[PDB]
Write a protein that binds this ligand. Structure first.
Ligand SMILES: N[C@@H](CCC(=O)N[C@@H](CS[C@H](CO)COc1ccc([N+](=O)[O-])cc1)C(=O)NCC(=O)O)C(=O)O
Ligand SMILES: N[C@@H](CCC(=O)N[C@@H](CS[C@H](CO)COc1ccc([N+](=O)[O-])cc1)C(=O)NCC(=O)O)C(=O)O
Lengths: 217, 217
């Protein structure tokens, strides 16, 4: 049994949670709590940051016995290696590495906007360059089942999470209809993922920390 | 022969340059130019961004025949695989994946500060938290020769680049003295690294884009 440590929000741990469910890895969760508004006291975490034995303490973390990890990408790669959900050939590895890093860029660009107090002033600019970014991903996937080829890999779980955040933001964006819509359903159709979403362990919201100008709950 | 595209700065391509040199990969460079101040016209790149055949156009890129890549970490992984400078055991791969992502955090937190107009206001806060970040790295490396074990890996190139930046910023920081100072020298003492540094291909500056509040040239 493994332990996943993160806040009581969706954030970065969403794709990790889906992956642990898909792989049927026995896990429990250390959800951390902030104090009330407006202070949002990080005490719950900060009093424990150093006593966990992590090499570079951060959130999320995963503990699997004496394996003690930080960094979301690193945590996903670890579960993926135990389940053969990494690339197999070099071209598949090239696809994983590029997408892993590109999706973080798209991730990070969206978070910046929703955390900035100039949110309203920045919104239109983001929405302009968005369809083009979406068109790039639509070109990449092509008529493929999954993003790296025929095999489901952990990058598909990142793609879904990133795509899901954009769909929650502007659900009417026509560049999200097409093979990119096909992809979202096909992932949600997966046996273990669908049953996870039908349960009460599922966290569709909030995507962001409470000090964000945008959220879904 | 391979082609590395990036601006005429140090930036993100520093680690990749050192790597291409250490591995003796034959390469040339498409270095991109901005217009003069204050506009800094990006047109040399923008007029070309789409015609290169990259899946997700960005800088740096690398072209090695029909392999055409973007994202710095993905570019480094590709050269590393050709020269067995990735992890070998599970433990080694755990260390590579966590450090790859951790050092990007460190890299980006520093960039944030040096591009912020509130630079002077934020400088003291950064310098308080920094000794602790450096002590974490110092504990991790330990008495080891390299960061992932016995073998040089691509993560040691990222480590050096990130540490070099801190060393240029605050050279008198006492937490930089010790095994992390030994590490910097050891890397610079590498036969093909040292030679590259004694040449005129070598770019110790500027670390940042010109719009930055801090730089070394
Ligand atoms: N590269 C690292 C980053 C870890 C990190 O950022 N730690 C945050 C997380 S999220 C932060 C809190 O609001 C979340 O904000 C975001 C950012 C992006 C997205 N997103 O979806 O793209 C959502 C929320 C933190 O709570 N701990 C910092 C600390 O203890 O010092 C990784 O991969 O794990
Ligand atoms: N995660 C990617 C990032 C690539 C990227 O940022 N391309 C930027 C400049 S890098 C940029 C220029 O100002 C960086 O800002 C900095 C500056 C310094 C440092 N650093 O580590 O010191 C990091 C980022 C660019 O030229 N392309 C933008 C575009 O084509 O739209 C990767 O790993 O490659």
């Amino acid at each position: 049994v493994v332990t996943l440590g993160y806040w009581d929000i969706r954030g970065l741990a969403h794709a990790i949670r889906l992956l642990l469910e898909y792989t049927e890895t026995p896990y429990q969760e250390r959800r951390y709590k902030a104090g009330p508004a407006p202070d949002f006291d990080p005490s719950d975490w900060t009093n424990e940051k150093e006593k966990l034995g992590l090499d570079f303490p951060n959130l999320p973390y995963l503990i699997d016995g004496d394996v003690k990890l930080t960094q979301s990408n690193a945590i996903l790669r670890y579960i993926a290696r135990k389940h053969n959900m990494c690339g197999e050939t070099e071209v598949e590895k090239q696809r994983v590495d590029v997408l892993e890093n590109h999706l973080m860029d798209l991730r990070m660009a969206f978070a910046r906007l929703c955390y900035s107090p100039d949110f309203e002033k920045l919104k239109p600019a983001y929405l302009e360059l968005l369809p083009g970014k979406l068109r790039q991903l639509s070109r990449f996937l092509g008529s493929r089942s999954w993003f790296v080829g025929d095999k489901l890999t952990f990058v598909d779980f990142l793609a879904y999470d990133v795509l899901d955040q954009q769909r929650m933001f502007v659900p009417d964006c026509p560049e999200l209809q097409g093979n990119l819509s096909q992809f979202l359903q096909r992932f949600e159709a997966l046996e273990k993922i669908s049953a996870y979403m039908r349960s009460g362990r599922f966290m569709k919201a909030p995507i962001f920390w409470y000090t964000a100008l945008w959220n879904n709950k």
